[PDB]
Assembly symmetry: C2
Homo-oligomer: 96 residues x 2
Amino acid sequence: TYHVLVQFDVPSDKAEAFAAAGLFDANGSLQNEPGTLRFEVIRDENNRNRFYLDEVYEDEAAFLQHCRNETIARFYELIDSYAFGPLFLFKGYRVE
Amino acid sequence: TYHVLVQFDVPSDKAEAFAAAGLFDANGSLQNEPGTLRFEVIRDENNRNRFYLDEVYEDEAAFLQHCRNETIARFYELIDSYAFGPLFLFKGYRVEGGA
């Protein structure tokens, strides 16, 4: 499996809005993309502005397909006015 | 849930030894620790030396329990001579209720 960790920063008063947008992305991607296997939104325990998306795909091609799909485009429409990112913390493969 | 992302760097000739140690840590923690819910070893797609541990716990207390248990202690005994880390990339809480 192909694991992609993404980091975003948002104004503190936009944190709840970002989290909703992240779950919108997760909901739509998991449901409609056969290559998208897991998609979690994580809030930093102390940094008031920082969130992480922990994404799992069958392979890199599935991630590139996600990048070309409608849900991620809808996600960016929601956050574009205020968010900073994506910053890719890593892309890698699971050691099974 | 409480999510912890850990990063390690190892010399190239110790990458297989690190993976074996990480697989021991993941299987030993998941099998024996009721608060340890998920534990994945991930190798960077290009960086030959870099590994990540993606750990999920019931709450912060369960991570701190993991930290005081015997599985992690043997993991560090296996990797001490060659590894660089842990570097904590993040600790955080999952936003719940999604599909």
